[PDB]
Design a protein around this nucleic acid. Structure first.
Ligand SMILES: [Mg+2]
Lengths: 251, 250
DNA sequence: TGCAG
């Protein structure tokens, strides 16, 4: 339906150079299939984002850096009006992580769109938790008339959100709100996804979407979510070692 | 014993306190473990001078001729040498490089490699550029060789994930052996008092990467232990690092 | 040549 917002969030694994060009074409095929209004990307590198800017011309692009690897937000120009953007630094990151924000108008409503790729690996629980607190604070404090959508690769694992006292009042995790469905829970699954070779099997819900409605208007609900990218491409590999999330909202 | 054995150890040659007593310590380990290959980091000329005098069962290759540098020792009775080379790391600020010795071990070609990757927490950028060079050389090594890289990589787990992980066919031996808790940390300021610091840091800097030969059945690691975790007569440890002893099913 | 849980 028309006023329904659609998004894709995906860590595209730009740090994996193997078949990277073919995999960027694969990403583009999913974007053409799903025509999302907003795309939140992690682990872009300059060659990858240059390619997307050549192909996905119906989108406006914002990046979290100009070199190394970084996040991106793409906004569908026919659907989403860009207002302003900013980058918030993570003071103690060892991995150049940060918080990229874009404020936009959509369906007569202000949206505050955010993405990050939180500090990586089990052993970085402490720094990752520090960054999570910064993200949740920015969600809470965002302009009262805006719907806030954070979507990114949080690297979060069991009990790390519980250990900060859970999500604050007014903020939900979309996968939780849609019923905690096993069918679309794990976004990183090394048994199912053969892109990285690993000594031990694991399944984690690293990619997450957090939603806050406007404080001054009726709340909106998520509609549906699905994991995407579970097809192999012509080159015999998946688009990424992560599955993407496609999600719609009742805006 | 058909099993190949190695020791890898950063000897901390930049710490000159009790250096002769500590080299004697290392030699005691070599006499006990009689490894087929020793991969050493942070040798200095005084140190390697001592080792060459004592460890007469070994053929020595050194990664430089002054300052501090790496070395590979080959047990002459077990390993036949073929050729060696040094790959330069163009943007190192610490004279780091990749030292490679190709050898045969009862007829099976081994491609032996060591490096001391750029030091310090804040050098992740140059360290990971060097790691990429290492992993590329392991991937491209001759199909008929078993590859063993062992060195002081100064790596943090995320730095490896952040280059895309280890390439297919390449494993980290400690991971492959089950991520065992008591042979995990190789630089541990709580357990090792040679460095006087007021904080606790426990790091897995010393690592071994293994690739099989296509021309032979796959190689698995057999057993690993951390060594050097006892004080010498002088009241210091052999190094601020623990050494790694490891065997392979070859 | 500054952890992990
Ligand atoms: Mg040192």
């Amino acid at each position: 339906e028309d006023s329904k917002l659609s998004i894709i969030s995906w860590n595209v694994d730009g740090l994996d150079t193997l078949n990277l060009a073919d995999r960027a074409r694969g990403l583009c095929s999913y974007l053409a299939l799903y025509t999302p209004d907003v795309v939140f990307l992690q682990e872009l590198i300059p060659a990858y984002v240059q390619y997307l800017k050549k192909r996905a011309v119906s989108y406006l692009f914002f990046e979290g850096s100009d070199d190394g690897y970084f996040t991106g937000i793409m906004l569908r120009k026919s659907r989403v009006k860009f207002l302003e953007s900013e980058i918030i630094c993570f003071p103690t990151t060892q991995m150049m992580r940060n918080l990229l924000i874009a404020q936009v108008t959509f369906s007569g409503q202000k949206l505050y769109l955010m993405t990050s790729h939180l500090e990586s690996c089990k052993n970085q629980s402490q720094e990752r938790t520090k960054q999570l607190r910064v993200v949740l604070q920015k969600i809470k404090e965002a302009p009262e008339d805006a719907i806030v959508i954070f979507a990114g690769d949080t690297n979060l694992r069991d009990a790390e959100v519980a250990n900060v006292g859970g999500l604050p009042a007014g903020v939900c995790d979309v996968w939780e709100q849609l019923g905690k469905q096993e069918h679309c829970r794990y976004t990183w699954d090394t048994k199912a996804n053969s892109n990285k070779t690993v000594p031990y099997v694991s399944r984690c819900r690293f990619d997450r979407i957090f939603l806050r409605s406007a404080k001054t208007a009726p709340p909106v609900t998520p509609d549906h979510m699905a994991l995407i990218g579970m097809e192999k491409l012509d080159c015999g590999r998946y688009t990424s070692d992560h599955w993407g999330i496609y999600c719609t909202f009742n805006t």
